[PDB]
Design a binder for this molecule. Structure first.
Ligand code: SF4
Lengths: 289, 289
């Protein structure tokens, strides 16, 4: 039974690297996996193919006229561990919906029989910042059931997590789209693990793993590869195996409970990211104080 | 003659603070200005109103049923220098186009006669990262003619600038939407000013100003106010006046020339942000090397 999963989360926090390393650990583990990149930047398959950039469905459709004109052998490319790799391409700037380009991509693969063909996992690496109806479309068209949110102990990455959660709550009644957990991509701030566990508890899910900051990640990715391929017996490689193992074994799939902005700030203030604001100096110049 | 302007740029680089300080410097200068916030986060008017958060059109429409049910006196709020302040509200998570929600807000103001009412400037603080058709709508529906891109000497902020430029190129023929320049929100990296000069040059525009990193920005914004109000004779306050003055005086309004990813990396490599990649170690493990 093929499990359709998605990795949602905002940019700049290392989401695609973690998606690729998790998927690599999962292929070393014997699983047949396909990565379908949905971020505007083509970064989701590079570490698997040792690529500078993969050719997207969007740019190859621009070349061949319409999407139907290209062959699957030009879209799907296998890399390390025989992990199949698709990159759908970003919205074409100024026009086009990010959501339409993503379902355009999904439907091409369905017809070309990429899903049917023996596969244990499908991972869509989707942008989850502003969860508009477009970036919410993999959830609405029920193309991904198990959503894992990459985030960190930072205000905007936590806010993005809560928005992705609100997205899932919106379509709870229409299907089987559920939140499988939070992955914390460490930024080495002090109470980060506890903070993301606290957020996961308010949301009704867990922190399925803490991925630490390790320089081997950078050493591996500068060679355009995952830590699993690069240095299989590193400390970090077992972190990715521990994440890959918990994902496989995961049964905690839920409808989350989104928190308010005040509650997001309570959690940030008590774990020391946010300072408590002093009411008395608001609106007052350096003259008054 | 009212000049309709927009500040485009990605998140996390201090865009809204610079928009607000520029607009404050412009009001000290005698101009009548309105800030219309278009980012999902309501941060665009807070420093002008000494607000924790302004009530958005989106949330007040949710309260009153439809957008027509609310009065302009509840949407537009005046702050420092009598700067009028609107916050349109983000896309409601999981649903809607972010672009449709933004132009719905602009149309509310048009009918309520906020533009007509003596105004020298209109500044829309818009998100410019993924320039999908939604976030490109102020450009397409020609609600803003002079677009200034906030960016910095960082890969994703430069990529975002080039995408906003491609957005403008798309609608060049349909109207008067032009690129007025790049504002660099300094991250204190070494060759940053020269890099954004060079980016602006490849793009066919200028770097209209360099906004440095100064602790007075943080001291002022923690009081929920602009450096212009907080300390009228700070070094930074004159930076904002210098930017405000060049904007007023600006005649450089161009259809930009977007660069390739390779060219974006040439510029980042020669200014020392990007390291040169060594081909020989790609795909090779720690065993080979
Ligand atoms: S729905 Fe979202 S991705 Fe699509 S055009 Fe609108 S803002 Fe863009």
């Amino acid at each position: 039974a093929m499990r359709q999963c998605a990795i949602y989360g905002k940019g700049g926090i290392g989401k695609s690297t973690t998606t690729q390393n998790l998927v690599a650990a999962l292929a070393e583990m014997g699983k047949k996996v396909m990565i379908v990149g949905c971020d505007p930047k083509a970064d989701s398959t590079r570490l698997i193919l040792h690529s500078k950039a993969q050719n997207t469905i969007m740019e190859m459709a621009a070349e061949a006229g319409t999407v139907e004109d290209l062959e699957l052998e030009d879209v799907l490319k296998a890399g390390y561990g025989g992990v199949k790799c698709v990159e759908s391409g970003g919205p074409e700037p100024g026009v086009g919906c990010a959501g339409r380009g993503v379902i355009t991509a999904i439907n091409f693969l369905e017809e070309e029989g990429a899903y049917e063909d023996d596969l244990d996992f499908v991972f869509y690496d989707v942008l989850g910042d502003v969860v508009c109806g477009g970036w919410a479309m993999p959830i609405r068209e029920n193309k991904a059931q198990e959503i894992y949110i990459v985030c960190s102990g930072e205000m905007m990455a936590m806010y993005a997590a809560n928005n992705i959660s609100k997205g899932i709550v919106k379509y709870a009644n229409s299907g089987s789209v559920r939140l499988g957990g939070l992955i914390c991509n460490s930024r080495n701030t002090d109470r980060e693990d506890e903070l993301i566990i606290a957020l996961a508890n308010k949301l009704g899910t867990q922190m399925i793993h803490f991925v630490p900051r390790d320089n081997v990640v950078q050493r591996a990715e500068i060679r355009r590869m995952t830590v699993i391929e690069y240095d299989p017996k590193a400390k970090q490689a077992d972190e990715y195996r521990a994440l890959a193992r918990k994902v496989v074994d995961n049964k905690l799939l839920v409808i989350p409970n989104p928190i308010t902005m005040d509650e997001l700030e309570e959690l940030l203030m008590e774990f020391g990211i946010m300072e408590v604001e002093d009411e008395s100096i608001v609106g007052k110049t350096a003259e008054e104080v």
